[PDB]
């Protein structure tokens, strides 16, 4: 008797996948990033994501080595699309990142807030009252989460 | 009709808490994403909700560890979902 988000829709909804791998440009232009290494392996995530959400009846929409500029552009498109016949929207972002931000393949910064706020109720009425999911895989700093000992679960 | 807040129905799934690093294995993907998909594939079929799934991800990624830099990873979902989000198969 718990309320549930409807999920029947023919294609369910789009599932973007900004997959950033080659950060060479970012190395060139941004000094504080003279060493960000390329994200070797993303491919496997992208693949897994595609397969998984494809199996869940979502229309995958990959994009590779996008710059901040390009990312915003891509979201703008989906922000303006008409999702009326869609039950859900998903956006996955695989890239480097820092506190609250996502790094563009060119080294530029994109606040995660700027990204998700693109799909509010006003910003995109076609999605109003529909789950808008964002999976962000990136660093949020250079610190290492330390481990603590405990008892088995 | 009726009204709901502008920022309702969102689900943000971060791979790591703020200020920390997340791990990517060149040979098999990121701890987070891989786990996410693994969990998704065996859970959704069973009709499990996304928050449940995300919790399992939290469990799993917690047991993982980068021995070298003696480090770990803590995923952190945040949400304004007003219903259970389930992905039927």
């Amino acid at each position: 008797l718990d309320k549930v988000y409807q999920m029947k829709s023919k294609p369910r909804g789009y599932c973007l996948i900004i997959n950033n791998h080659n950060f060479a440009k970012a190395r060139e232009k941004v000094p504080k990033l003279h060493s960000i290494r390329d994200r070797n392996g993303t491919h496997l995530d992208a693949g897994a994501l595609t397969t998984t959400f494809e199996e869940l009846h979502f229309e995958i929409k990959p994009h590779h080595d996008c710059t901040v500029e390009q990312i915003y552009e891509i979201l703008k498109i989906y922000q303006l699309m008409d999702h009326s016949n869609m039950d859900c929207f998903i956006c996955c972002i695989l890239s480097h990142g820092d506190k609250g931000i996502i790094y563009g393949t060119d080294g530029q910064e994109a606040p995660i807030y700027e990204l998700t706020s693109q799909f509010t109720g006003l910003k995109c009425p076609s999605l109003a009252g529909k789950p808008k999911v964002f999976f962000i895989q990136a660093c949020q700093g250079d610190n290492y989460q330390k481990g603590i000992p405990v008892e088995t679960d | 009709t009726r009204y709901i807040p502008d920022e309702a129905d969102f689900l943000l799934g971060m791979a790591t808490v703020n200020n920390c690093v997340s791990y990517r294995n060149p040979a098999e993907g990121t701890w987070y994403i891989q786990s996410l998909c693994q969990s998704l594939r065996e859970r959704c079929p069973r009709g499990d909700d996304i928050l449940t799934i995300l919790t399992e991800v939290n469990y799993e990624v917690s047991n993982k560890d980068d021995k070298k830099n003696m480090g770990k990873q803590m995923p952190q979902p945040t949400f304004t979902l007003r219903k259970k989000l389930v992905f039927p198969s």
């Binding site: 250079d142 | 990121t30 830099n69």
Partner: peptide
């Protein structure tokens, strides 16, 4: 084992 690589950081993002």
């Amino acid at each position: 084992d690589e950081v993002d």
